[PDB]
Amino acid sequence: LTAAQQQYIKNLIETHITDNHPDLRPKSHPMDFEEYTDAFLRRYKDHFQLDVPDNLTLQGYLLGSKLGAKTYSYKRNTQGQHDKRIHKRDLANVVRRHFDEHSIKETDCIPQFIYKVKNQKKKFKMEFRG
Amino acid sequence: YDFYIESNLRTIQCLETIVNKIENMTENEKANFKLPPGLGHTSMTIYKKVIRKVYDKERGFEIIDALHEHPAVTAPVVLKRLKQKDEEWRRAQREW
Amino acid sequence: ETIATRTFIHQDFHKKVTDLRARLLNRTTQTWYDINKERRDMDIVIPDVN
Amino acid sequence: KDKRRFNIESKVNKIYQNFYSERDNQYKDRLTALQTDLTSLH
């Protein structure tokens, strides 16, 4: 009731109370690879045969605390092993770098796209790298 | 009606086996391929009979022999037509 | 109560794991038979008319 | 600019043609992938 808090509260409710249209759901940038389901990341890393470990999902990353440090997951992911998973940000940065450096020129990117789209329902078709 | 349609189907089967043998070859083992009378039917005459009834009994011996000496080019045509006569003869059975 | 929910946690894990494995087996053997059928369908030289 | 349309159709037909020609050794690869997936799930 002081001509500042009024519009403050007004903006708050005008920004948090809407009709939840699916047309307003906040969508992430295409270049930020951390917002990619962590199975896209693993399939990318596994397809281009990169050299990274797998990531810690979110349950394995909050599982790290003095109390959480006694669970089988911590003691299987933090001792001396080779399967030692990592934080999603690291794998996502490796993937992003191999994305911005390895490059492509069309004349083979498009016809492959068309052959892919026109055969979605087919089980027996050209695997474009496998 | 039932006899004619069942015989046409069984001959379709035998001709399909042969045509599949003929498709995957080299273009010179085709030209010299010959099948003896009978083809593997222990009661062979049926197929000839069928083919007669499909074309006629005048212009049917000509074809029955033309695929006895050129099974490579003249039995993807005798088969594409048995596969019309099966469909048509079953619809005729229904309509009557 | 904490003993009971400990048991519940471990039973739920066991359930989800065995579902995982049976489902992956079924999916691979599905894809196999679909590959078989789409292979033989490229072998037809004269199709059916209708 | 129909040359671009001709290029693209030629390439896509090329992909179809290559797959149909190699269609017999591009089918044991599928089945070895599948058999190893099966024996490794087991």
Binding site: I110, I114 | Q84, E87, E88, R91, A92, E95, W96 | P47, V49, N50 | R4, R5, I8, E9, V12, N13
Partner: peptide, 30 residues
């Protein structure tokens, strides 16, 4: 045109039932 109406209980079996123009056209527009 040789339409051949003769005695027929059944109809004649119908004739059984490339061309990347608008796709590459979409790519032009894009």
């Amino acid at each position: 045109i040789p339409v051949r109406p003769e005695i027929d209980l059944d109809p004649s079996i119908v004739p059984v039932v490339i061309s990347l123009n608008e796709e590459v056209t979409f790519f032009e527009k894009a």
